Design a protein around this ligand. Structure first.
Ligand SMILES: C[C@H](CCC(=O)NCC(=O)O)[C@H]1CC[C@H]2[C@@H]3[C@H](O)C[C@@H]4C[C@H](O)CC[C@]4(C)[C@H]3C[C@H](O)[C@]12C
Ligand SMILES: C[C@H](CCC(=O)NCC(=O)O)[C@H]1CC[C@H]2[C@@H]3[C@H](O)C[C@@H]4C[C@H](O)CC[C@]4(C)[C@H]3C[C@H](O)[C@]12C
Ligand SMILES: C[C@H](CCC(=O)NCC(=O)O)[C@H]1CC[C@H]2[C@@H]3[C@H](O)C[C@@H]4C[C@H](O)CC[C@]4(C)[C@H]3C[C@H](O)[C@]12C
Ligand SMILES: C[C@H](CCC(=O)NCC(=O)O)[C@H]1CC[C@H]2[C@@H]3[C@H](O)C[C@@H]4C[C@H](O)CC[C@]4(C)[C@H]3C[C@H](O)[C@]12C
Lengths: 334, 335
């Protein structure tokens, strides 16, 4: 069974199975783990770089042109949620990294100023791996970022926000939203850090350098973009009876959505409050009830996060009150 | 464990004899060999070293001990280990061309002696393809990462071999020249070599040829040729090295390893071809001391008759066989 087929992150494939008169739900969320694998760019493109330029040509000529086809082309996706945040600065960021001009930079972000954040993230991630998806359906070779080769030995990644405790960098809880990091000239990304690991621990800002500075910022942006794509599909799924009613009584799907939102719970305030609530209800909530938690999570009043002191322990992001642990975030695979 | 050839790169080994049920069992480790062939996948060769900062090199350089293992890490000429003089002139100007570095300190890789360590050279060029330039001073400098090195980093198996034309059709041909004789004539003899990479998906390295990737193809082939030369140089020296050979003289398990090692270059080097052929004839049950007598005959065209041997490529394996018998089976190299 297909769940959310016209969606980049929420595209799923569930398989109901009856064994010994006990039902078992096995969920597959390939689009999500495909988009998070952008955190290791060389691995994201390691198989596609050998398919050849032919790959793109076949997708473009097909008349159906579904969202999965348009995502592979790093193009705006009709029939799927899109955004407008800092589209002006997003387009000139394409033109800066790829050294391409304005006229056909509009072909990624049109005059509508609407783009698919994950389709944008795919474009920039492939560029860091050395492949530039062009306006025409072609692969063009661009310089491979050193940072992308540095990080390709890592298997675990943990983004989080930081602040100063007096000459010491300490984790701070997400107060802004991920979208609000794309403005002010992307200068809000300096307060984000991804801790890569091999399970040895290496923070991405520890590797900061004049040579690697550009690669650091793009990689952070792609994570922010994948977070926006996630919010946009989570927001749209709520107002989508067609798909939500299909998974309405699949409680196993709540752990997956929680697992997914957990990825951004350290950098997005809405995903922070959303995951907190579901840990309170012990993650045993039917899908339809889950999205009311997603919809309340949009209000600063929904959970009391001010009294929550967070600490970083053994590659896990702990958010906990003195009484008990409220939320454990685990590093995302690849 | 017990150390074998500790002042060598490709042949550095560590053996541990263990007696179980009053039966002795030998466990052999040849780290230097599999470290040098891992250069066939450059990004993987440097995937762990790129995280260590330049301070690493300084710690090894400041040491006055200056052993061969230390000097290999510095991509420097190695005293106390065999070195070569073949096309040293063109090897140095190839350093200066790829790294855009000048002549004066290009001599510091290949001195006025014109002696160099082929594996130290292979390490220098392999690290460059992974984006890191080992400098004359102990420092890591960032150089453009070769696209080809990223292309090949999904592959797990590699099989070098020599090629020829069958009338508009590329066919495998047996090694008639030595690997060294592929570094001369401006390195134009490498156009007859091909490496079939695979994921066991099969991709020949010349299928990926392009103006953008042309340099990367040639450097990767050269490093394989260089690692083969390093192997010959240590194999030649081991024969006249009683100190080490007598320690492992009766270790028949060591014969499979040397055969497994020489098999890697048996497809592009004529000497390694005849050497591996011989040991397959004696069913690979040869004591180490006798093995290196076979290695010494292998240097002569007359030792085995290879002219009647038609070679073919079967499911990613290099078959050399005629009549009704498989004379040599070469398997793809891991990583
Ligand atoms: C954490 C502090 C700011 C003080 C603070 O805690 N405010 C949080 C807040 O903005 O609310 C910031 C400001 C200057 C930053 C550095 C500079 O921008 C330079 C450089 C930029 C790099 O993107 C990440 C490393 C770092 C050293 C940055 C680390 C860190 O990002 C710093 C040292
Ligand atoms: C932070 C990185 C890298 C900076 C650098 O080269 N190192 C400086 C250092 O190490 O001191 C830069 C590279 C190109 C920049 C972008 C481009 O110039 C285009 C555009 C320019 C605007 O003034 C600010 C937004 C932004 C998207 C820029 C954001 C950000 O400013 C980028 C993505
Ligand atoms: C095998 C044939 C030559 C016929 C032959 O067998 N003569 C051997 C001989 O020279 O004695 C050569 C000539 C043209 C070569 C190609 C061109 O030089 C272009 C290009 C050059 C690259 O170095 C390796 C790949 C290849 C496609 C080459 C593959 C292969 O190297 C070819 C197709
Ligand atoms: C074959 C490759 C790549 C050629 C290329 O850019 N593509 C051409 C194409 O695709 O037609 C070149 C790049 C630099 C060359 C070397 C440098 O020029 C230095 C030096 C120059 C000598 O004339 C011949 C030996 C060699 C080592 C050269 C061997 C070989 O000639 C190299 C290693």
């Amino acid at each position: 069974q297909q769940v959310c087929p016209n969606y980049v992150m929420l595209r799923s494939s569930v398989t109901t199975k009856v064994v010994r008169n006990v039902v078992e739900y096995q969920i597959r969320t390939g689009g999500f783990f495909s988009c998070l694998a952008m955190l290791r760019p060389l691995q994201y493109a390691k198989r596609e770089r050998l398919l050849g330029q032919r790959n793109l040509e076949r997708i473009s000529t097909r008349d159906i042109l579904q969202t999965r086809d348009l995502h592979s082309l790093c193009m705006p996706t009709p029939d799927a949620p899109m955004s407008n945040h800092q589209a002006s600065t997003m387009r000139e960021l394409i033109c800066s990294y790829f050294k391409v001009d304005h006229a056909d930079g509009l072909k990624y972000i049109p005059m509508d100023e609407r783009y698919s954040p994950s389709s944008l993230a795919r474009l920039f991630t492939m560029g860091m791996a050395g492949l530039h998806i062009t306006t025409e359906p072609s692969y063009k070779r661009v310089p491979i970022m050193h940072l992308a080769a540095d990080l390709d030995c890592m298997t675990l990644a943990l983004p989080y926000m930081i602040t100063l405790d007096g000459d010491t960098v300490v984790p701070v809880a997400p107060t802004l939203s991920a979208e609000q990091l794309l403005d002010d000239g992307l200068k809000g990304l300096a307060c984000m850090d991804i801790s890569y690991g091999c399970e040895s621990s290496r923070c991405i800002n520890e590797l900061y350098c004049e040579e690697t500075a550009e690669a650091i910022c793009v990689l952070k942006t792609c994570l922010v973009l994948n977070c926006m794509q996630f919010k946009l599909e989570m927001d749209d799924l709520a107002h989508n009876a067609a798909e939500l009613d299909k998974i309405q009584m699949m409680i196993p799907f709540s752990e997956r959505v929680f697992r997914m939102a957990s990825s951004f719970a350290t950098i997005d305030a809405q995903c922070f409050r959303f995951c907190v609530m579901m840990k309170d209800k012990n993650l045993k909530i039917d899908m339809r009830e889950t999205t009311r938690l997603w919809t309340r999570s949009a209000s600063d009043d929904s959970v009391a996060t001010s009294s929550l002191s967070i600490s970083l322990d053994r590659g896990r992001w702990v958010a906990a009150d003195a009484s008990d642990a409220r939320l454990l975030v685990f590093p995302i695979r690849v």
